Amino acid sequence: MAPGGYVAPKAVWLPAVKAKGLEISGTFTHRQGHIYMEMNFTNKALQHMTDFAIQFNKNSFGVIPSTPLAIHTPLMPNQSIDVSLPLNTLGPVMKMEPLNNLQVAVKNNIDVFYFSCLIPLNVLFVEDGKMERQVFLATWKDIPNENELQFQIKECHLNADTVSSKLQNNNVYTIAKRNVEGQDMLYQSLKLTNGIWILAELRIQPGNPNYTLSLKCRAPEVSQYIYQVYDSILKN
Amino acid sequence: GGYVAPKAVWLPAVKAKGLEISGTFTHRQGHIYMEMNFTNKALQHMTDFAIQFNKNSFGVIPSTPLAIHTPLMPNQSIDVSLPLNTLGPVMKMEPLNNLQVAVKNNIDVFYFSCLIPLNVLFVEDGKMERQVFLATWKDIPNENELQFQIKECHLNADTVSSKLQNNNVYTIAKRNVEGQDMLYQSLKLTNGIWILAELRIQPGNPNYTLSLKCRAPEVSQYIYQVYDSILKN
């Protein structure tokens, strides 16, 4: 566990085979307020690479780079560079499918290449995500039960204290806890970069290698993606 | 006539040893064309032009060889109209409507990609029966429903329908609920995909909500984009 929270390992986003020798692998981070696309560019061609630039298609959460890609030295054959690209969420918005899809165009001196990758939604959980208890109860009551979606986190053996701590490290806050007949119930909140609040109730059972995650959100389409995030945080 | 995008420089001269290609796509009387402007910015004359498309999402392929017989002189340009069909080999592209192209002349072979606006692939026979619309809209899982905003549109419902009809997007029903207009629309792609749409127009809201349902929901953003372009042009 690290400050900033869970970072997935880099995955190959653009194979050298699809980009005339250019290989790009990447991941996303959220560190001290700022979001980054952390990439490694590798030149697997026999000629050097220059004139690098990046653009993102419009996307669900308005993600966009905050600065141009600035690689001021030519990327030599077989050379590899780490690139940290700061991002913000004030860019143009277009609904993606899947919801967290990000389409990226990368140009060098050779051509323009395209790829997509999936933004893990945890990088879009804001620090300001701790709901007031009074507001949680009222909001949970009001939100129609049509919006409630349930998930199972399976093969998890952490206690309620450690679950709470790991989730808090990722801006998911536990604002209340209730213990009824061997079962821990954690009431939790988080908030995304676009203002959407998600309310969670997490239930922990003994003899049960799996927890029940119940999510309520006025935009319920995000819920399944929030689940995948919880699972990753608690399995890692 | 439907929406035609302004030509864009698909191939700048400095990337193709003097060869510059400007282009757009058109759909005229049931025929698809790649409309290109070839300019010779080199010092040498150009001959032996030929074009090839890589496999692509919608099976787009030229219907004939490019056939430029007359040589192209330095600083001279020609406007070419290349007829296309959708019976070619298929491969899913990223983004979906990106097309990989190679153009050859006497100097070298050059590679570029361009954007196919999906309206050129909207077929004339795209008016759905109301009965089938209603049953299909209900049956398609709501997880396949995607919603977009057409922002700061200054068009009334009737101009919206007419513009869209000129692009083979059919309004099969128009319903008023509590002041709010709801336009129910259909279109079909050259590959047989039907898209169902509901456009909500609320008086006092210049932002219209477009809801799309399709059994291939991945096409939706591309439909929205050309839909937006049609109403802004």
Binding site: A53, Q55, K58, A105, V112 | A8, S113
Partner: peptide
């Protein structure tokens, strides 16, 4: 634009 190659940049 997005998807229009060199014209994107």
């Amino acid at each position: 634009s997005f998807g229009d190659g060199f014209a994107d940049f």
